[PDB]
Symmetry: C3
Subunit: 250 residues, 3 copies
């Protein structure tokens, strides 16, 4: 009866608290209903499970099940090699993926998420992309869409969208190799942009002052796309028809 | 005397260490001066307090006080439902909000912060916005300004600024639905921008090469805003006054 | 024999588990081969070391060695004042710096990293910049380059690059006070940009529609950079040479 300290079912296995189970070699189970099943597995807290080697489950109802799993917080389940699940009810099912926040699931490989999702009975906002990171609330990435970075809320990415970045609240991305600043309804302005580098090859973002003034433009190409009349040949009568100009002008 | 294991004041309550207090049902208090007051509350470390149900306080002088609070690290106080405070002296006072770093306070709802702030005797850099996330050092968001994302240092947002994103060090935002890349003193250039989609409705970011060359421009609208003379009617004498042109030209 | 509870070598020092060492005042060592050497140092888990005052080492093979160090997870070594190392094999060697993820090292001051790196026998992706934050996989920042923010993967910053931000996968930055959206090989488009503010001083990002239409341009400056002929003086014969125009036109 009462809390007690005793050896588990394996060598160097420690059970501390009430109704604790330690089965792995060099494992430790501290708290109430804490299970340490694999070798060098530490499970500290209340109702925590450590079913993987070298796995750590700290907090409340945390689950670790792979070779290096860290489940710190409340109701987090880190099921992935070298994966970390931190916060409240964060599920990581990928490889070398991390997740910090509340009610977020990351099933992608080498992926990550930092924000708040939603969990009624299932995860409605999940990260299924590889090498993809999300920072925001209620953001979704479809499976097969990789190398996507989200900085915003209520951002959803469809299938087959690679190398895309979405910035701002309610951002929407619909193509690959693009950076989205907003949706079709709300469009954000880019303020305090540096001076451009107008040239034939330079690829910068021009400013309103440059377009207002037109410094550095091609004075020859622009004079052909729009048919303009330079002041010199007007003053000098160059490129003038003479057979019918003499008719109207007598 | 000495460290001892014993039952607390409730059923299935475990006190481990020296001067430990466990009052909640199914609670555990491990370490020195560790207090577990609510049901299924785990407080591990030195001088940690767990005053909320299902709350976990791990580390040094960590405080948890709500239904799902995670206070991991040093001097962190997570006071919020489903809120997580990780790092050194991080205070979370919002709902479903997370905070990782040092000396940062997040009072917003569904908000977050990842960086370094300042705490002399009070938090001088705090997040008071809803659905707002900060990544950087010494960043401030005023109350009432929501859906704001900061990626930079020394960035301050005033009141009534929504849907704004600030990028880069020393960035400044002064309007809603805008993305700031810098301040009035330093302006950053946007480099390696993709080719534009010049049209009547398309809203992209043009490049220096496009403005240099002018491909895809409206050859009719641009020829009216600037009064230009096309080469065809000059060659053909169209739209010519005849009553007074005959005077100067004889 | 077996797990036991006993006092350490200092006042209020608690050793729990098998082969645990507690030498600091008010320290606690819980688990297997857990060492708490400094005052108020807590080391919970398997093979964890707490060699700094007020330091917390939780998890598996975690090391804390400064005045406020948090090493939570697997194989994390937080060597820095007010520094936090969370995840799997994260090393923090800076001051007030945090690191969350797997196989990432942060040697910068007030710096941070959130992502996945690489550790064969040494850290190949490290953050050596001050006040710099990285979010992505396999990203590198050279020493001396400060105030740099990275949101992407496979992004490397050379020496002497300050106030630079890189967005997107495979982004490349080569200058200071610039924002990079891509590399010389892949260039990303900026989509859904708000309407510009064309003026003499305003510095915004223009859209394709504005350049297509040319609203708000300088009708006087643009008519001098490109020599154009306004329709009024053509209709009115102003600025016309008369001594030699009478020759070709008779």
């Amino acid at each position: 009866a009462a809390p007690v300290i005793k050896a588990g079912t394996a060598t160097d296995s420690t059970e501390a608290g009430v109704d604790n189970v330690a089965n792995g070699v060099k494992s430790s189970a501290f708290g109430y209903d804490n299970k340490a099943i694999e070798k060098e597995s530490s499970a500290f807290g209340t109702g925590n499970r450590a079913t993987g080697e070298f796995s750590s489950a700290f907090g409340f109802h945390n689950i670790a099940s792979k070779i290096h799993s860290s489940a710190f917080g409340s109701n987090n389940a880190a099921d992935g090699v070298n994966s970390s699940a931190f916060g409240f009810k964060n599920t990581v099912s990928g490889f070398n993926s991390s997740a910090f926040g509340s009610q977020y699931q990351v099933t992608g490989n080498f992926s990550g998420a930092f924000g708040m999702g939603e969990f009624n009975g299932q995860y409605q906002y999940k990260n299924e992309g590889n090498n993809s990171y999300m920072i925001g609330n209620k953001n979704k990435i479809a499976s097969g869409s990789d190398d996507n970075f989200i900085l915003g809320n209520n951002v959803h990415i469809g299938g087959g969208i690679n190398n895309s970045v979405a910035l701002g609240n309610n951002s929407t991305v619909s193509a690959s190799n693009t950076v989205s600043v907003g949706s079709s309804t709300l469009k954000r302005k880019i303020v305090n942009v540096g001076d451009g580098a107008i040239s034939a090859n330079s690829s910068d973002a021009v400013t309103g002052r440059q377009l207002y003034s037109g410094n550095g433009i091609d004075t020859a190409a622009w004079q052909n796309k729009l048919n303009v009349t330079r002041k010199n040949d007007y003053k000098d009568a160059n490129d003038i028809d003479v057979n019918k100009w003499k008719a109207k002008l007598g």
